[PDB]
């Protein structure tokens, strides 16, 4: 992806994180586990939802074909009618398919971006109190118990304390 996180420096996703789209996995002497980041997850749900509704709504006003009949000596206008109706269908079919392709690409990149930004957010807190391993993970120099871990997820990681 454009942002390098999803299937990039973070090799794969987590079956074990069930309660959100992005989040944290911690590992210390007390144990280990997954925790979803609420804020970035809800941000993602709002954006994607607004997008779907934006897509649906923009295609609201669109060509509707009507039945018209013509006799045996009105072939020219019958053909005109047919070419007119088909012309608009092809145009709206193109619009719909292209919009889906273009916005699907942007949806995947958007998720990649949200992960990258969450990773940077944590990197910018920890700074030089942890080793950046290169795979999404940070190895602490000090012991980091569950309250220590929580402060990282908080945004409250007290850097001068360590």
């Amino acid at each position: 992806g454009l942002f390098g996180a999803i299937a990039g420096f973070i090799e794969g996703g987590w079956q074990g994180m069930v309660d959100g789209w992005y989040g944290y996995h911690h590992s210390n002497e007390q144990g280990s586990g997954y925790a979803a980041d609420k804020e970035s997850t809800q941000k993602a749900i709002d954006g994607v939802t607004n997008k779907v509704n934006s897509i649906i709504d923009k295609m609201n006003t669109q060509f509707e074909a009507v039945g018209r009949e013509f006799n045996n000596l009105e072939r020219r206008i019958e053909n005109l009618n047919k070419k007119m109706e088909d012309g608009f269908l092809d145009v709206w079919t193109y619009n719909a398919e292209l919009l889906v392709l273009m916005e699907n690409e942007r949806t995947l990149d958007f998720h990649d971006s949200n992960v990258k930004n969450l990773y940077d957010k944590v990197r910018l807190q920890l700074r030089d109190n942890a080793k950046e391993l290169g795979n999404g993970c940070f190895e602490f120099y000090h012991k980091c118990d569950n309250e220590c871990m929580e402060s990282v997820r908080n945004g409250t990681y007290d850097y001068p304390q360590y």
Binding site: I6, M17, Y22, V100, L108, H111, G136, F138
Partner: protein, 321 residues
Amino acid sequence: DQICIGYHANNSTEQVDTIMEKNVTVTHAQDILEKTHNGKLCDLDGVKPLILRDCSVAGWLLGNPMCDEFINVPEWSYIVEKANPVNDLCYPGDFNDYEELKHLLSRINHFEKIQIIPKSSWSSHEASLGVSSACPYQGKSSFFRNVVWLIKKNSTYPTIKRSYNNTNQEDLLVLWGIHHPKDAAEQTKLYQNPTTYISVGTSTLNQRLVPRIATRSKVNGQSGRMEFFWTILKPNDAINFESNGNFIAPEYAYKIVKKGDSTIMKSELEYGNCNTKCQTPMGAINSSMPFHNIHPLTIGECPKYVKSNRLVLATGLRNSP
């Protein structure tokens, strides 16, 4: 001790396309294209369609004897007509401005048939011998029930001069016709007078028809032809007829009581005993999807038609193997 940043994966096999890559497996997706229908013709919002079956719009409106099922049809939502209905014009001929009338019907939901010129009131002409083997009913020769094929009485066809005044509130569809005979002998045989005409007038209309004679091939065993005409007589307006012969006089005309959204749908299907909010010629649709690919000609509250086989939006993210 470490903390890691990551993202969701699951057992999903849903796939989406992008510009640069096809068949990307994602954790979540949303299909937006309706692909299914029930394959039936249904009531639209409870209001049943007019299903003409083997009859055409002409056979129906003119009153083809084989189309008595539709002698007095109630309000309809839409109309269904086959591609080649067999019960069209039983006596061969033409229907003038037929397509413009069918178009007029797409803005009509209900007709009320009424009598404007009684069959009994033709006291100087023979009104009960206007039949043909081309229009059979229960083994006997009959004719279009809504118009009267007038012929000579006691070897005389005196000039007809009839007027009807539209005293109804509703616009009135009036139908009449002209008979084109085989040869000069048949003309005098039916109408006496060798040179005849039909003159029709209204507020706007200024018509004068003359019967054209020619040797013609036998359709339904007839060398003669019937050419049919129509007009919309507005309220407080009068229609005026004058003729020497060959006149196919109106008996019944249709009041236009309800004008609204309708359509003539071409289909070989029959009634489904069914209800829907969106109908196509191939079947009805019950869907909350914004798009469908069933058929372009629909009626009701429908999704938008596209020619796609597949429209699926990504919502989740790229799923991991």
